[PDB]
Amino acid sequence: MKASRLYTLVLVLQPQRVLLGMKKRGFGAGRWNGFGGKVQEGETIEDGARRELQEESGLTVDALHKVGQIVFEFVGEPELMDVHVFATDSIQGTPVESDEMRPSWFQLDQIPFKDMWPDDSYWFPLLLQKKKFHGYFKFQGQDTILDYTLREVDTV
């Protein structure tokens, strides 16, 4: 079984809107997403999530809730991406554009699925329903899912 590398993903989810960022370079460029990246040596996963949110959007938070975990496999890539997904409703500061991301708010009846990773269509609705989840998706390239599993869980 492949080795895995730890990543974070943070969704600022308010009652009528969600904050996403347009990825300007790198992995997932051209897609709207939450904020996140590789966990670094010595930090907890939650602290890595807080750090990435600050670096990519300028925001800080008073509390981060773990809402899901998704493992990604790409054909032809040796490592799995083990993504720990967090949400918060209560941020401090305004979002700012970074080298990585252009933040923008979306109303919750305008979630931009066509410009998001394809797997987000499956798990994002669970997030919105306050349901914790575990997932796994195998991709060929950026657009094609070959296999996936998704489970509602009581504990992430």
Pairing of strands 4-13, 80-88: parallel
C-alpha pair distances (Å), 113 with each of 3, 32, 35, 110, 124? 29, 8, 16, 8, 9
Residue 133 engages ligand 8DG in binding (rule: CB under 6 A): no
Residue 72 engages ligand 8DG in binding (rule: CB under 6 A): yes
Work out how close the CB of 78 gets to ligand 8DG at its nearest, in angstroms, rounded to a whole number. Answer: 15
Per DSSP, what are the bridge partners of residue 38? 7
Residue 9 engages ligand 8DG in binding (rule: CB under 6 A): yes
Token pair 């296999």 in the structure block, residue: 147
- Locate the DSSP E strands across 14-140: 17-23, 32-33, 60-61, 65-74, 80-88, 91-92, 101-107, 133-140
In one-letter notation, the amino acid at residue 57 is S
Residue nearest to ligand 8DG (CB): 37
Is 139 known to sit in a ligand binding site?
A: no
Q: Which is nearer to Na ion, 32 or 133 (CB)?
A: 32
| Binds Na ion by CB under 5 A, chosen from 13, 33, 34, 37 | 37
Q: Which is nearer to Na ion, 146 or 153 (CB)?
A: 146
Residues that bind ligand 8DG (CB under 6 A): 7, 9, 26-28, 33, 36-38, 72, 81, 83, 100, 117, 119-120
Residues that bind Na ion (CB under 5 A): 37, 52, 113, 116, 118
